[PDB]
Design a protein around this nucleic acid. Structure first.
Ligand SMILES: [Zn+2]
Length: 446
RNA sequence: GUUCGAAAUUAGGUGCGCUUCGCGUUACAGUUAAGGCUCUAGAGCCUUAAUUGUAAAACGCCUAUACAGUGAAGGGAUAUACGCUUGGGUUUGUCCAGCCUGAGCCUCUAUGCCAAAUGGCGCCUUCAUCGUGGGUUAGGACAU
DNA sequence: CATTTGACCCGCGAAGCGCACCTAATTTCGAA
DNA sequence: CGGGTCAAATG
């Protein structure tokens, strides 16, 4: 093998071929997770609002009444409850709800049910039993316990090696799980400081995670010492990296980033391969995919042929203020940059915007300016519900460009067989695709 | 006695999943503040910006045998499910991740909250009732 | 009038829970 | 952070 991997690169120094691994999948999953969290928060907000509306209408506070107005507006921003006394606390929102429903002449049971709606848990929190480490011995596929549920077994695993009799071992085990008793025992039955910490840690600490062995095998681990450490749960991004490297190996070991070492070591054997744990070889993405974003995350405004969007003054770049629609605020922003000298950093800053007089919002917060969107065109605009989005995956091929079947019903501009990366006699696609900085129209299939 | 292997423990980092709280975006509607034009100091319209409210945030796919509210009763560690067995939806060229989830079950895993036993509560179940919902999707491989 | 050709575009923050998989170190037991 | 966008410019 000779594989050696590190940082963003790897080398199969059997051969001396270097390979570049994907160093993005982690950040892509991170934002595929932030998006899912945003979506689920919004769905729970809709659930809660539906329930609150139904209840308020059921008790005579119909939508036209001020009680409904106030309570429904309060239910949009209910505050946080992870702690107790950028957001208000659940208690302040519920205090305002009580105030409004009292002023509405509501009964105690009604206010209490509205409070229950404001405190309801719409999606269960399930985290106590999610990741399931199975027992290491080959004949025991059963679940290992959480280490906090078998503190007795873990304490026994340590006390079974003390120079004392079994009766004193059992007494000590029962005492530590009787506080000064264990201290006196150790003070008399001199024991190593590390062993004493370990037993105290098992007795007292918050034991996250599971044990390598089940109940029936925690103590028997010495009988299985020759079996190496096993792995079952590796990060999908590291899995993608390592499996791309392994696929390269399959098409075509002192393996010196260290995470996931055992997963490679086990895939390299797939039975007994030994392991000895830009010039890297000398030391030794497809955004059109079916799971990529169909469009941008921030919707755009598309009015009478002009694409614009609101960007904060601290989000509009120096040298680009010409996209700001307002003539007056363009001049104001230019008057701000010939004092700020922001051309280097180009980002501008909250303090600078406030000093320049762009703090116009409710909380003295920096205003926003509508700016025209460069780098986009009409062909990329889609409309879903009220939102207009830029889609970078509008092109799936060219026959005249071919529109994305997942967006044909949403394109604002009506439409008038080389796919991307095909071999022809393609890095960017269109009616005259870019083929490799040369662009041509008369490509032919090859 | 060195080395190596395992387990345990601790700290760091990396990452994965769940549940929320916001800001920002967008659509409409109402206001305020200006800028302009147009009718005639006002009045009508367009712009920008602020402030209010409500609504959308991937497309889709799958579910009404579904889903949630309310009430009653029963069960609640001889119990349930995030567990086990075995699925199904997302799901498509195909296969997956991840999430969700049905039926049976308690051999492994887990089991919360408010008040020493015990007591409520969440929880599970059946029914009655008003109904209109719920899950997943912004990732990876392969083929094309 | 098809090509270069050069600049431009792209959602952020926090909290509460779980978890694994690698480093660093120690104990203990097994071996080779 | 590729896949485009526009307008410009041997054209
Ligand atoms: Zn076992």
């Amino acid at each position: 093998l000779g594989i050696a991997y590190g940082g963003k690169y790897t080398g199969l120094a059997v051969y001396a071929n270097r390979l570049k691994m994907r160093d993005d999948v982690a950040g892509i999953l991170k934002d595929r997770r932030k998006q899912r969290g945003i979506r689920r928060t919004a769905q729970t907000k809709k659930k809660r609002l539906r329930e609150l509306k139904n209840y308020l209408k059921s008790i005579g506070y119909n939508e036209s009444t001020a009680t409904f107005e106030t309570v429904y507006s309060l239910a949009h921003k209910r505050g946080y409850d992870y702690a107790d006394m950028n957001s208000r606390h659940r208690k302040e929102v519920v205090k305002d709800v009580h105030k409004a429903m009292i002023e509405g002449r509501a009964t105690e049971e009604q206010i209490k049910r509205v409070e229950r709606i404001f405190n309801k848990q719409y999606r269960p929190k399930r985290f106590n039993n999610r990741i399931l480490t199975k027992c290491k011995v080959e004949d025991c596929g059963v679940n290992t316990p959480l280490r906090k549920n078998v503190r007795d077994l873990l304490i026994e695993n340590i006390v079974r090696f003390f120079p004392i009799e079994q009766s004193e071992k059992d007494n000590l085990k029962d005492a530590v799980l009787r506080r000064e008793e264990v201290k006196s025992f150790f003070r008399k039955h001199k024991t190593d400081e590390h062993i004493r910490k370990q037993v105290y840690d098992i007795a007292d600490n918050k034991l996250s995670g599971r044990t390598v062995f089940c109940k029936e095998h925690i103590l028997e681990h010495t009988e299985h010492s020759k079996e190496e450490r096993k792995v079952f749960r590796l990060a999908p991004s590291l899995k993608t990296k390592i499996e791309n490297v392994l696929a390269v190996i399959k098409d075509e070991v002192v393996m010196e980033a260290s995470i996931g070492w055992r997963y490679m070591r086990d895939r390299l054997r797939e039975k007994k391969l030994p392991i000895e744990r830009l010039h890297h070889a000398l030391d030794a993405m497809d955004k059109g995919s079916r799971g990529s974003a169909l469009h941008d995350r921030n919707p755009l405004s598309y009015k009478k042929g002009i694409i614009t969007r609101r960007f904060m003054v601290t989000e509009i770049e120096c040298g680009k203020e010409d996209d700001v629609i307002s003539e007056t605020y363009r001049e104001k922003l230019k008057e701000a940059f010939k004092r700020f000298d922001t051309k280097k950093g180009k980002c501008l800053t909250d303090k600078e915007a406030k000093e320049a007089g762009f703090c116009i919002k409710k909380n003295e917060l920096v205003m926003s300016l509508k700016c025209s969107i460069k780098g986009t065109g009409p062909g990329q605009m889609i409309r879903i519900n009220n939102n207009v989005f830029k889609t970078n995956v509008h092109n799936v091929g060219v026959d005249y460009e071919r529109k994305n079947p997942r967006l044909s019903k949403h394109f604002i501009e009506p439409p008038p067989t080389l796919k991307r990366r095909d071999m022809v006699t393609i890095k960017k696609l269109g009616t005259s695709p870019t083929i490799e900085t040369v662009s041509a129209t008369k490509l032919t299939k090859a």
